[PDB]
Amino acid sequence: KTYQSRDLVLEPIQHPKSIELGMPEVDQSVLAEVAERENVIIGVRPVDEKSKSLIASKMYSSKGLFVKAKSSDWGPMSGFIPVDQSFAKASARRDLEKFNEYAEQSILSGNAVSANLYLNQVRIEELVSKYESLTPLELDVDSGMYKTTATNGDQTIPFFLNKVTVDDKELWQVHYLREGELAPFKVIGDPVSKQPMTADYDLLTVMYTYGDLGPQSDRLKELKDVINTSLGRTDGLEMVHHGADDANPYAVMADNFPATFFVPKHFFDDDGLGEGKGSIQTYFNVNEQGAVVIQNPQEFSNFQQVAINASYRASLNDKWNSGLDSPLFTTKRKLSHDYLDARDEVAKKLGSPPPPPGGAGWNAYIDNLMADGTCQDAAIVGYKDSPSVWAAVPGKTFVNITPAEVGVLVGKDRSSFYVNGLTLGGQKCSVIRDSLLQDGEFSMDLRTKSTGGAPTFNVTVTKTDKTLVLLMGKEGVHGGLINKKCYEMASHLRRSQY
Amino acid sequence: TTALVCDNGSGLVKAGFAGDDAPRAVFPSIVGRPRHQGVQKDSYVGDEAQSKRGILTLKYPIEHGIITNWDDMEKIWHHTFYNELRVAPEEHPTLLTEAPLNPKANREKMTQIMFETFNVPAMYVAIQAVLSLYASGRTTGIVLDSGDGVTHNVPIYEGYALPHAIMRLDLAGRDLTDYLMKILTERGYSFVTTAEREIVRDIKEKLCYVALDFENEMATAASSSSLEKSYELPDGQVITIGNERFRCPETLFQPSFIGMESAGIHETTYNSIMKCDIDIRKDLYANNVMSGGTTMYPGIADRMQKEITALAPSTMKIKIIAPPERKYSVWIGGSILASLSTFQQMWITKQEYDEAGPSIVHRKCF
Ligand SMILES: Nc1ncnc2c1ncn2[C@@H]1O[C@H](COP(=O)(O)OP(=O)(O)O)[C@@H](O)[C@H]1O
Ligand SMILES: [Mg+2]
């Protein structure tokens, strides 16, 4: 079954394919459980596929704030941020002075340390055999280390790896030729744990239920602590960091997609997207671990609309760079469907007599009231002595008003008409406001009562010294407009002693 | 041009732009002025006033839904326009909300301030409950609006509140927070200060719920720990919240919990329906809409369904609607109304105000 809500159409995924993600699957399951326990939607930016084993080792720290030095995508330092930025990706290598200064200033400001780089056996096997990023290790008998070169970046630079034991673990320390001499290779490390920084779990967005939106970022700080607590890494080796760096003037699909979203479990139920609307995994690619994989801006827009429709929203107190491109990303484009549908329903649901002054002709007064096209009926009724209709619109309701009906409108009792209304020309009406005894108003506002879906209309009655001025709006005409018109006519009549 | 929508809440101001599905600004309806009148800023609004409470005398100019101090209210509106929304009021038609049964002198003063102080090109005053009904996609029904300082039952016929049938209950969220502080203090803890009131408000909003059968739930709480929840206080200590989870919102149904001799929200709902025409009562019973922050408790719609069913004729079709966004439905309903083409006909223009004066609000807004 196809999903449809207003202009949102989601076709069912026929034969879903597995999507490679950089975040270890063990951590995807942790985040899926956090989204359920905390009743929130969490989105995490892609983690580079090649950094998976570094994160899975749980040996390293992760990229904190105020680190503008670039990571490397080659050699034994792949996945790490080298202190010497000539070892970083191509963009840093062509801007050495700028990036070397960022690396040194991160250390000088206490936001990083210069750390040694140790790799585990899994990593040496990945770089040599899985990715073929390094040439096979060759023992250099004079140093006791293994020489290798990169198969990308600068292929003329030899690297030297040494078998070392660091806290009962058999690791490989990376060395290089610094000014022609063997030296330990340095990477940017966390200032508290002193461990090298890998990529972190950078939050793309967090969407909360209403019972978490408002004045009382504290909530996001609390959620980040729950995430790090559930990830269970050693203190100092956190994958999620408090705060966030600038939005940056950059783009590239690999930076924001494929994003991993984690949602409360009710989304996976057969009534996940509504009542008989289907499960979220029918329309979005969800893996075995509960990760909802968002691969492009159109899918991100569709997922965000589904979340907003389910009453999960990004907080006002939080700052996000949620967008990248623009397939309907503005506030007007992402309005909740409950808001738009209610607006549509409300718009639909809302729709012998004495001689008059200036000569003669009470019909002219009715013509005046009827001129602007807002009213369907109008009347001037004498209420003193024997009540009678002085003038009214022919073939409508007010023309048939009786003395008994006038008696109810002007009567001493101001509460019996609240039992079940009153009538005007036989038409049943409910009393909305009784200001008949309020100085400067002397009016009553009513609304007709009808059956099934037949339209109902607002009515105002204003009392002068000798008359009642009555007006009935057309369908959709607001009671305030009719009351104002009736008041103005009554004021004119009062000025002429009527 | 975009219309502005300002919901003048007894506890919180919710403000923003018509056409948006959420307010941009939510802040306390508080004004602080220096305690010493002798020699940075002559006044503070919202969170800033609360933080400088040691320096200022704090006033709540809309404490029970009705504005009582116009000088403080003008500071709140000035703060809303210039500091929160960052707009020039003279460029925007402005929809203001008002409490049910707002006195005539008050809505005239609100109209005079918008036109003479802020120079808005147009304005309208709508009853808060009516806007919540519109946010639920309805024009007829009965709204139970429970906010910070006041609760009302407001029956509405085709967009028009019926004032003869409105019921007011002088208890809402503020009273529930104070009651929770009192019953936790009864256990030997101490929750009395402003900072402690914020802890207890957080406990209330996170852990409280409405029991389906209060006496049965009390018996369950005294026989087992199944309903207990643990809460970590700012100092690191842990407090167990047990029967207080449901005794706190029980006050809405039993106001005698706080020494009030008023009927409960289910009884005032019935009373309000019965004050309306016989012909509308079935429509009100089938359209009970809950709104306001104090209707957020889990279990409240099921409890209202049970209570109203026990009161009404057994054949009566009863329905309770409690939207997920009910904490902001008054604002949302205002955004809906002010974004419709029909609203251009409803607003009071500066030309109409110059002709008729403040009493134009009686004629145009109801
Ligand atoms: N999740 C919740 N559970 C219980 N009470 C809540 C919840 N969220 C907000 N409240 C309470 O609702 C009140 C604010 O509601 P609101 O409708 O904005 O009031 P007002 O319009 O009178 O300013 C406060 O007392 C607040 O503690
Ligand atoms: Mg309110």
Side-chain angles (χ1 to χ4, degrees):
Chain A
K1 269 188 178 297
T2 299
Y3 177 73
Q4 184 264 334
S5 165
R6 302 187 59 92
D7 55 343
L8 178 62
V9 165
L10 303 175
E11 302 286 3
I13 300 175
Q14 306 229 101
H15 312 279
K17 281 88 190 167
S18 188
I19 306 149
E20 184 162 22
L21 311 163
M23 173 184 291
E25 280 183 12
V26 70
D27 287 352
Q28 298 179 28
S29 298
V30 164
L31 290 172
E33 295 303 313
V34 170
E36 169 65 2
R37 294 196 310 276
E38 299 299 310
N39 194 26
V40 294
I41 290 178
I42 300 159
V44 188
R45 277 193 176 88
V47 174
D48 151 53
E49 292 172 350
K50 288 199 181 33
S51 297
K52 182 182 287 180
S53 75
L54 311 179
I55 295 165
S57 77
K58 298 170 181 199
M59 289 202 282
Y60 306 112
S61 268
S62 73
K63 190 178 164 184
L65 306 169
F66 323 118
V67 173
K68 299 184 69 90
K70 294 190 165 310
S71 64
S72 180
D73 56 357
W74 64 285
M77 57 276 169
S78 192
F80 298 95
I81 303 175
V83 177
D84 175 343
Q85 290 273 290
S86 72
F87 292 103
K89 58 189 47 178
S91 51
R93 306 199 304 267
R94 68 182 168 257
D95 254 311
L96 300 173
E97 297 178 27
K98 183 165 79 114
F99 287 94
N100 275 329
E101 187 60 26
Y102 286 149
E104 298 298 356
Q105 286 303 312
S106 73
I107 293 170
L108 298 170
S109 69
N111 297 126
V113 299
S114 172
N116 286 325
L117 176 58
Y118 302 101
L119 309 178
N120 66 15
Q121 190 62 42
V122 160
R123 188 57 163 190
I124 300 317
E125 298 191 40
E126 284 183 317
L127 296 176
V128 171
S129 307
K130 183 189 183 181
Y131 305 124
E132 294 185 290
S133 300
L134 293 173
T135 59
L137 268 53
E138 287 173 329
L139 179 77
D140 176 53
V141 58
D142 272 333
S143 68
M145 304 195 180
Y146 288 78
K147 190 163 64 180
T148 184
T149 60
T151 65
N152 73 303
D154 185 348
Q155 304 184 221
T156 69
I157 303 176
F159 293 91
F160 298 84
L161 306 175
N162 197 34
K163 278 182 169 99
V164 291
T165 304
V166 179
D167 304 332
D168 309 300
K169 290 192 182 193
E170 289 305 304
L171 305 175
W172 288 94
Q173 180 173 3
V174 182
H175 299 262
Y176 76 123
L177 297 168
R178 183 181 192 134
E179 301 193 300
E181 306 193 69
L182 201 63
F185 190 92
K186 307 291 185 177
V187 296
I188 288 297
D190 177 89
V192 179
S193 72
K194 315 304 184 182
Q195 304 312 302
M197 290 178 196
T198 68
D200 69 322
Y201 292 155
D202 191 33
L203 298 187
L204 186 57
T205 186
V206 175
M207 305 171 84
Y208 306 96
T209 202
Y210 272 101
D212 281 338
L213 299 165
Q216 195 205 131
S217 180
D218 153 274
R219 180 76 186 92
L220 179 58
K221 197 268 176 188
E222 288 177 5
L223 180 61
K224 284 179 171 178
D225 286 341
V226 165
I227 294 172
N228 285 324
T229 300
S230 308
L231 282 172
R233 294 173 183 245
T234 308
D235 199 81
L237 311 179
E238 289 77 33
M239 287 299 293
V240 183
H241 307 263
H242 293 294
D245 285 320
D246 46 89
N248 238 7
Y250 292 91
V252 174
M253 287 280 297
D255 291 321
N256 293 272
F257 304 115
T260 55
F261 276 78
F262 299 97
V263 303
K265 290 181 195 186
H266 69 80
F267 281 99
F268 306 123
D269 293 343
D270 293 312
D271 60 315
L273 308 192
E275 40 278 292
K277 299 288 174 179
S279 61
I280 198 162
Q281 66 265 38
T282 306
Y283 309 100
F284 299 89
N285 284 291
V286 180
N287 67 16
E288 319 69 32
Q289 287 67 38
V292 189
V293 187
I294 298 304
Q295 308 158 102
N296 57 67
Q298 187 53 69
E299 203 156 47
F300 185 35
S301 182
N302 290 341
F303 177 84
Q304 184 183 52
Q305 189 65 61
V306 167
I308 287 165
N309 290 356
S311 287
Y312 290 84
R313 310 172 67 87
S315 174
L316 300 170
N317 317 329
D318 295 358
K319 171 246 300 180
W320 304 118
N321 333 319
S322 306
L324 183 61
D325 292 281
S326 279
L328 62 133
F329 262 120
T330 80
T331 62
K332 204 257 206 187
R333 299 292 195 270
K334 60 177 175 188
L335 294 170
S336 106
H337 287 190
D338 277 356
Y339 174 84
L340 302 175
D341 286 346
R343 183 165 68 183
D344 289 347
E345 287 302 319
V346 168
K348 177 192 180 196
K349 282 171 177 154
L350 293 186
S352 64
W362 284 108
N363 278 355
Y365 276 82
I366 299 315
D367 287 354
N368 182 280
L369 293 164
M370 295 289 293
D372 69 14
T374 59
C375 303
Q376 69 172 281
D377 202 358
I380 295 176
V381 174
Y383 71 93
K384 301 294 196 178
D385 313 320
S386 284
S388 74
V389 175
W390 296 356
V393 180
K396 298 296 299 182
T397 310
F398 299 154
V399 57
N400 307 127
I401 293 173
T402 67
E405 285 168 343
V406 171
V408 170
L409 290 169
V410 310
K412 191 176 293 210
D413 177 305
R414 315 305 303 169
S415 58
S416 299
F417 45 51
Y418 294 132
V419 168
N420 209 18
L422 51 78
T423 68
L424 293 171
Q427 174 64 53
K428 290 181 64 179
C429 300
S430 285
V431 176
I432 307 298
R433 295 201 296 192
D434 175 21
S435 320
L436 200 82
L437 318 174
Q438 283 175 26
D439 196 50
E441 298 301 335
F442 320 116
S443 62
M444 293 177 67
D445 301 299
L446 305 95
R447 175 125 171 177
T448 66
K449 281 184 289 182
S450 203
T451 184
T456 60
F457 315 104
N458 286 80
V459 162
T460 294
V461 179
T462 304
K463 183 172 113 84
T464 73
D465 187 52
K466 301 165 182 64
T467 83
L468 297 181
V469 179
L470 294 95
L471 219 48
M472 182 182 300
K474 285 183 179 164
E475 184 176 1
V477 174
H478 192 249
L481 185 155
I482 296 143
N483 182 296
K484 180 191 169 219
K485 278 181 61 80
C486 200
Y487 175 97
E488 293 177 343
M489 176 54 74
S491 187
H492 165 73
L493 292 171
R494 272 195 216 85
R495 288 196 285 275
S496 284
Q497 302 296 117
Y498 272 113
Chain B
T1 178
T2 310
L4 304 181
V5 176
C6 183
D7 177 20
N8 305 304
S10 65
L12 296 162
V13 171
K14 280 72 78 178
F17 301 94
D20 291 355
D21 62 355
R24 296 298 178 88
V26 180
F27 66 89
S29 310
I30 300 172
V31 175
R33 301 173 180 277
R35 21 190 78 197
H36 172 69
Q37 288 182 326
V39 173
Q40 302 89 354
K41 273 180 65 52
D42 83 312
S43 69
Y44 292 95
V45 174
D47 296 310
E48 202 161 50
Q50 188 72 267
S51 70
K52 300 184 165 60
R53 69 175 169 268
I55 314 163
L56 313 164
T57 292
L58 297 181
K59 290 185 188 297
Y60 311 87
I62 336 166
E63 195 159 48
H64 310 105
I66 309 299
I67 301 160
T68 59
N69 192 283
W70 296 105
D71 286 342
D72 295 349
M73 197 64 214
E74 277 202 6
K75 293 300 194 210
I76 287 180
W77 287 318
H78 186 279
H79 180 79
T80 305
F81 297 135
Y82 290 106
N83 298 319
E84 297 284 349
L85 304 180
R86 294 168 282 109
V87 297
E90 70 270 14
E91 302 175 358
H92 304 267
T94 302
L95 172 62
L96 294 176
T97 77
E98 71 178 340
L101 303 178
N102 193 26
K104 184 163 182 300
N106 281 61
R107 54 209 316 275
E108 284 174 353
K109 189 67 168 166
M110 189 155 82
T111 302
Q112 176 181 1
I113 292 174
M114 291 294 127
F115 286 115
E116 299 183 16
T117 299
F118 296 106
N119 196 30
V120 303
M123 54 90 69
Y124 188 90
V125 184
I127 296 165
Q128 293 147 10
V130 173
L131 301 182
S132 287
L133 191 68
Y134 290 162
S136 81
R138 286 169 176 84
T139 65
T140 291
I142 181 168
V143 171
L144 171 66
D145 181 334
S146 190
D148 192 59
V150 72
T151 297
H152 289 93
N153 304 88
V154 182
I156 299 154
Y157 179 47
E158 294 296 348
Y160 298 89
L162 301 174
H164 68 280
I166 292 172
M167 298 297 294
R168 179 181 165 187
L169 167 59
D170 294 310
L171 98 83
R174 190 187 299 140
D175 309 276
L176 298 204
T177 294
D178 293 353
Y179 179 57
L180 185 54
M181 295 168 69
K182 177 202 188 205
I183 67 182
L184 293 178
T185 299
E186 280 170 357
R187 281 171 52 208
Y189 288 98
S190 189
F191 293 104
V192 301
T193 76
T194 291
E196 286 158 357
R197 180 171 278 106
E198 283 307 294
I199 298 164
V200 173
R201 186 182 60 86
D202 194 57
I203 298 178
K204 181 190 68 167
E205 300 183 6
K206 291 185 176 338
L207 302 175
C208 288
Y209 70 94
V210 170
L212 187 66
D213 186 294
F214 181 72
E215 291 303 325
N216 286 354
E217 208 79 356
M218 282 291 287
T220 296
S223 81
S224 64
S225 63
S226 64
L227 305 173
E228 298 177 355
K229 288 288 179 166
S230 304
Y231 181 92
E232 188 182 330
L233 296 169
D235 65 354
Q237 91 178 282
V238 173
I239 180 176
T240 295
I241 315 295
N243 61 18
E244 300 94 351
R245 292 183 71 198
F246 57 89
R247 282 164 65 204
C248 171
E250 186 68 11
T251 307
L252 293 173
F253 299 91
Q254 308 192 60
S256 60
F257 279 23
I258 64 170
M260 283 185 52
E261 31 177 7
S262 169
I265 58 170
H266 56 310
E267 297 167 322
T268 60
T269 293
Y270 170 86
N271 194 10
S272 179
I273 287 172
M274 299 306 284
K275 291 177 174 181
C276 302
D277 285 10
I278 293 175
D279 292 343
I280 201 182
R281 300 180 197 156
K282 282 170 183 29
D283 295 340
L284 303 182
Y285 272 122
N287 293 281
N288 292 86
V289 175
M290 308 294 111
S291 67
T294 296
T295 67
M296 281 294 288
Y297 300 93
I300 200 175
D302 287 349
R303 174 72 176 276
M304 282 287 339
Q305 177 74 25
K306 178 193 156 187
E307 297 295 350
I308 300 303
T309 292
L311 295 173
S314 64
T315 56
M316 191 70 63
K317 175 69 194 178
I318 297 160
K319 181 176 180 180
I320 315 298
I321 299 104
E325 65 278 7
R326 63 196 180 272
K327 214 159 66 145
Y328 299 131
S329 59
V330 170
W331 190 87
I332 297 172
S335 171
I336 286 174
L337 186 64
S339 70
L340 291 170
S341 61
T342 211
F343 179 69
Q344 297 183 53
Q345 321 306 314
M346 306 168 64
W347 67 46
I348 295 168
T349 68
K350 174 64 165 168
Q351 173 171 301
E352 279 170 319
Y353 180 82
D354 285 345
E355 290 163 13
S359 65
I360 193 57
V361 71
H362 181 88
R363 289 170 255 158
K364 301 261 288 180
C365 308
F366 73 94

